[PDB]
């Protein structure tokens, strides 16, 4: 069933869609997608990485 599940690598819908795989860069987990109680939202992290008085610039 591994190979009946990969029955269509070569239908036209499944070639034009590109597939990304990368070996995981182990990076500090900051997430664009959801801001919640864990302070990991990357934009909030980026404003914290801004120097004092640069968002006014």
UniProtKB/Swiss-Prot annotation:
Domain of life: Eukaryota
Cellular location(s): Host cell membrane; Host cytoplasm; Cytoplasmic vesicle, Secretory vesicle, Rhoptry
Coiled-coil annotated spans: none
Role this protein plays: Participates in the formation of new permeability pathways in Plasmodium-infected erythrocytes enabling the uptake of nutrients from the blood plasma.
Subunit structure: Self-associates. Component of the RhopH complex. RhopH complex is at least composed of CLAG3.1/CLAG3.2, RhopH2 and RhopH3 with a 1:1:1 subunit stoichiometry. CLAG3.1/CLAG3.2 mediates subunit association through independent contacts with RhopH2 and RhopH3, which do not directly interact with one another. Interacts with RhopH2. Interacts with RhopH3.
Protein name in the entry: Cytoadherence linked asexual protein 3.1
Protein species of origin: Plasmodium falciparum (isolate NF54)
Residues of the full protein shown: 625 to 681 of 1417
């Amino acid at each position: 069933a591994m190979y009946l599940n990969i029955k269509d690598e070569d239908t036209f819908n499944k070639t034009v869609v590109t597939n990304y795989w990368y070996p995981s860069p182990i990076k500090k987990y900051y997430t664009l997608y959801v801001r919640k109680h864990i302070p990991n939202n990357l934009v909030d992290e980026l404003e914290k990485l801004m120097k004092s008085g640069t968002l006014e610039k």
